[PDB]
Design a protein around this motif. Structure first.
Motif, PDB file in Angstrom:
ATOM      1  N   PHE E 154      53.165  38.324  41.675  1.00  0.00           N
ATOM      2  CA  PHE E 154      51.913  38.898  41.779  1.00  0.00           C
ATOM      3  C   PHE E 154      51.583  40.120  40.951  1.00  0.00           C
ATOM      4  O   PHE E 154      50.589  40.512  40.684  1.00  0.00           O
ATOM      5  N   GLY E 155      52.723  40.751  40.482  1.00  0.00           N
ATOM      6  CA  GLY E 155      52.674  41.661  39.594  1.00  0.00           C
ATOM      7  C   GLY E 155      51.787  41.417  38.162  1.00  0.00           C
ATOM      8  O   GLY E 155      51.129  42.349  37.698  1.00  0.00           O
ATOM      9  N   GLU E 156      52.163  40.137  37.824  1.00  0.00           N
ATOM     10  CA  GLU E 156      51.420  39.851  36.623  1.00  0.00           C
ATOM     11  C   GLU E 156      50.111  39.811  36.681  1.00  0.00           C
ATOM     12  O   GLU E 156      49.259  39.866  35.746  1.00  0.00           O
ATOM     13  N   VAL E 157      49.642  39.182  37.877  1.00  0.00           N
ATOM     14  CA  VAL E 157      48.156  38.912  38.163  1.00  0.00           C
ATOM     15  C   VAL E 157      47.514  40.463  38.192  1.00  0.00           C
ATOM     16  O   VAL E 157      46.493  40.613  37.775  1.00  0.00           O
ATOM     17  N   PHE E 158      48.259  41.258  39.143  1.00  0.00           N
ATOM     18  CA  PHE E 158      47.464  42.381  39.301  1.00  0.00           C
ATOM     19  C   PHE E 158      47.565  43.343  38.141  1.00  0.00           C
ATOM     20  O   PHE E 158      46.561  43.896  37.721  1.00  0.00           O
ATOM     21  N   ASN E 159      48.781  43.616  37.854  1.00  0.00           N
ATOM     22  CA  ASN E 159      49.082  44.559  36.736  1.00  0.00           C
ATOM     23  C   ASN E 159      49.053  43.837  35.465  1.00  0.00           C
ATOM     24  O   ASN E 159      50.067  43.042  35.114  1.00  0.00           O
ATOM     25  N   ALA E 160      47.972  43.978  34.580  1.00  0.00           N
ATOM     26  CA  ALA E 160      47.760  43.207  33.361  1.00  0.00           C
ATOM     27  C   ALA E 160      47.054  44.107  32.455  1.00  0.00           C
ATOM     28  O   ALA E 160      46.618  45.030  32.622  1.00  0.00           O
ATOM     29  N   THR E 161      46.924  43.463  31.081  1.00  0.00           N
ATOM     30  CA  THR E 161      46.526  44.357  29.985  1.00  0.00           C
ATOM     31  C   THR E 161      45.016  44.097  29.954  1.00  0.00           C
ATOM     32  O   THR E 161      44.309  45.372  29.513  1.00  0.00           O
ATOM     33  N   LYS E 162      44.448  43.301  30.353  1.00  0.00           N
ATOM     34  CA  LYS E 162      42.907  43.148  30.461  1.00  0.00           C
ATOM     35  C   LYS E 162      42.508  41.746  31.370  1.00  0.00           C
ATOM     36  O   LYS E 162      43.316  40.763  31.443  1.00  0.00           O
ATOM     37  N   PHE E 163      41.174  42.058  31.760  1.00  0.00           N
ATOM     38  CA  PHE E 163      40.552  40.890  32.475  1.00  0.00           C
ATOM     39  C   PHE E 163      39.590  40.429  31.970  1.00  0.00           C
ATOM     40  O   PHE E 163      38.761  40.965  31.384  1.00  0.00           O
ATOM     41  N   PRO E 164      39.150  38.915  32.280  1.00  0.00           N
ATOM     42  CA  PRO E 164      37.938  38.466  31.604  1.00  0.00           C
ATOM     43  C   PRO E 164      36.830  38.777  32.306  1.00  0.00           C
ATOM     44  O   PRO E 164      36.612  39.381  33.209  1.00  0.00           O
ATOM     45  N   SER E 165      35.637  38.565  31.745  1.00  0.00           N
ATOM     46  CA  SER E 165      34.212  38.802  32.235  1.00  0.00           C
ATOM     47  C   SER E 165      33.916  38.134  33.380  1.00  0.00           C
ATOM     48  O   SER E 165      34.941  37.230  33.916  1.00  0.00           O
ATOM     49  N   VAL E 166      32.799  38.477  34.056  1.00  0.00           N
ATOM     50  CA  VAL E 166      32.315  37.733  35.252  1.00  0.00           C
ATOM     51  C   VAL E 166      31.930  36.373  34.872  1.00  0.00           C
ATOM     52  O   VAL E 166      32.417  35.375  35.790  1.00  0.00           O
ATOM     53  N   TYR E 167      31.147  36.060  33.893  1.00  0.00           N
ATOM     54  CA  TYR E 167      30.542  34.764  33.563  1.00  0.00           C
ATOM     55  C   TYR E 167      31.613  33.951  32.856  1.00  0.00           C
ATOM     56  O   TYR E 167      31.674  32.555  32.818  1.00  0.00           O
ATOM     57  N   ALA E 168      32.837  34.578  32.631  1.00  0.00           N
ATOM     58  CA  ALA E 168      34.146  33.768  31.927  1.00  0.00           C
ATOM     59  C   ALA E 168      35.352  34.074  32.739  1.00  0.00           C
ATOM     60  O   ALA E 168      36.435  34.306  32.077  1.00  0.00           O
ATOM     61  N   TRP E 169      35.142  34.235  34.007  1.00  0.00           N
ATOM     62  CA  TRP E 169      36.444  34.316  34.919  1.00  0.00           C
ATOM     63  C   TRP E 169      37.486  33.265  34.736  1.00  0.00           C
ATOM     64  O   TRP E 169      37.039  31.936  34.818  1.00  0.00           O
ATOM     65  N   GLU E 170      38.620  33.645  35.009  1.00  0.00           N
ATOM     66  CA  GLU E 170      39.761  32.743  34.812  1.00  0.00           C
ATOM     67  C   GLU E 170      40.512  32.798  36.254  1.00  0.00           C
ATOM     68  O   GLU E 170      40.640  33.900  36.814  1.00  0.00           O
ATOM     69  N   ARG E 171      40.807  31.654  36.806  1.00  0.00           N
ATOM     70  CA  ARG E 171      41.809  31.486  37.989  1.00  0.00           C
ATOM     71  C   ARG E 171      43.091  31.483  37.653  1.00  0.00           C
ATOM     72  O   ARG E 171      43.614  31.210  36.468  1.00  0.00           O
TER      73      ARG E 171
END
Lengths: 49, 63, 49, 49, 177, 49
Positions: E154-171
């Motif tokens: 879960f640390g890799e999902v929560f603590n990351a370097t950047k998150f994608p945009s809303v229209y290009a969200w990744e699961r």
């Protein structure tokens, strides 16, 4: 007297807290009564000796 | 305020001669802690066993 | 007056009031025991007590 | 010690206590004079007074 | 006035028609109301006087009712309650001549009483007598198990370097952890 | 390391490592026995030990 305590006197297992988690209470009644009778007979023999 | 050897009733209807019988169903242990409302006031105590003694004449506590 | 029947020291029913009328005492145990045989010897005679 | 040489020899030769089987029962070995008085019990319920 | 309040569902009608210390003890067991009665002429007005006062049963009406309260004392008034609860314990009852008790020993207050109940005697001789066995009731509870076998990332999902945009969200496909 | 739990000579579980962390020993038997009553005589006094 110690070794006779771990003896299956017609029951499933000679260890308590094991026949209560795998059998029904009505059957557990007899499963415990058999061990109780066996242990009482062993202790009576020990007391006679 | 203390039930000093009080509340000894016949547990059954069996007549017994001179002997020492051991009763298990008998209640009201000796030297207990009773709650006497010596004032009377209508209160609602608990149940499953009580000791209703009345020290008043003319049968005041009758209900 | 409230007692109906009564037991003995051996936890056996000793007395009981008459349900019909004339409430009096009740059953006492009957005669029993072990019959023994007295024989003066088969070779001596055939008598028996 | 408050015993003689013969008493010491008797208490140091036959006092084997079945080494290996001494733990088959609970007992509070030791003396109050040594201020240790270690109490030891077992699950079997067997105690030696 | 509580009697004439309502009579919606009535059953089991039984009317039995025909200082002072009148004691009563009520017992409910398997749907059976045991009622006992006893009388003793007293003179003190402080509290319950000393004595034995063997009780006499009077009524045993079952009624099939699990009673849980009692109230509605008299009015227009000394008036006390002196009510005491009871616990299931063992008793040793003496039976003197003519079927009277006059003496009892509660085997729950002192070790001497338990000894008197064990040997079935009111006069105990001098000496040590084994009576019963004591046990230590456990207070707390300890539960221990292997802490973690496959720690969930879960640390890799929560603590990351950047998150994608809303229209290009990744699961994610985080499973078996 | 391969040993998870340990039994005694009386075929009773003696100790076991802690499965979470800080693997140490485990349960020791509790105090029990038969309580005795010391009475100097009912006719003499009413004391009790």
């Amino acid at each position: 007297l110690v070794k006779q305590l771990s003896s299956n006197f017609g029951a499933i297992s000679s260890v308590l807290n094991d026949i209560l988690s795998r059998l029904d209470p009505p059957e557990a009644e007899v499963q415990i009564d058999r061990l109780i009778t066996g242990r009482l007979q062993s202790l009576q023999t020990y007391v006679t000796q | 305020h203390t039930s000093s050897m009080r509340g000894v009733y016949y547990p059954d209807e069996i007549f017994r001669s001179d002997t020492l019988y051991l009763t298990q169903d008998l209640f009201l242990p000796f030297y207990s802690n009773v709650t006497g409302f010596h004032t009377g006031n209508p209160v609602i105590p608990f149940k499953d066993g009580i000791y209703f003694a009345a020290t008043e004449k003319s049968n005041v506590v009758r209900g | 007056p409230f007692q109906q029947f009564g037991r003995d020291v051996s936890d056996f029913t000793d007395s009981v009031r008459d349900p019909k009328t004339s409430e009096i005492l009740d059953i006492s145990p009957c005669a029993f025991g072990g019959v023994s045989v007295i024989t003066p010897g088969t070779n001596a005679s055939s008598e028996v007590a | 010690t408050k015993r003689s040489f013969i008493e010491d020899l008797l208490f140091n030769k036959v006092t084997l206590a079945d080494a290996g089987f001494m733990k088959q029962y609970g007992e509070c070995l030791g003396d109050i004079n040594a201020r240790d008085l270690i109490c030891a019990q077992k699950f079997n319920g067997l105690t030696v007074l | 006035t509580m009697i004439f309040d309502n009579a919606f569902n009535c059953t089991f009608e039984y009317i039995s028609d025909a200082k002072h210390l009148r004691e009563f003890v009520f017992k409910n067991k398997d749907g059976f109301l045991y009622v006992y009665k006893g009388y003793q002429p007293i003179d003190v007005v402080r509290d319950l006087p000393s004595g034995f006062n063997t009780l006499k049963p009077i009524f045993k009406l079952p009624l099939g009712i699990n009673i849980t309260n009692f109230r509605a004392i008299l009015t227009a008034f000394a008036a006390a309650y002196f009510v005491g609860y009871l616990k299931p314990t063992t008793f040793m009852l003496k039976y003197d001549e003519n079927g009277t008790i006059t003496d009892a020993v509660d085997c729950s207050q002192n070790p001497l009483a338990e000894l008197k109940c064990s040997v079935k005697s009111f006069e105990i001789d001098k000496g040590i007598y084994q009576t019963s066995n004591f046990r230590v009731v456990p207070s707390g509870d300890v539960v221990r198990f292997p802490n973690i076998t496959n720690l969930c990332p879960f640390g890799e999902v929560f603590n990351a370097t950047k998150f994608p945009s809303v229209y290009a969200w990744e699961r994610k496909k985080i499973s078996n952890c």
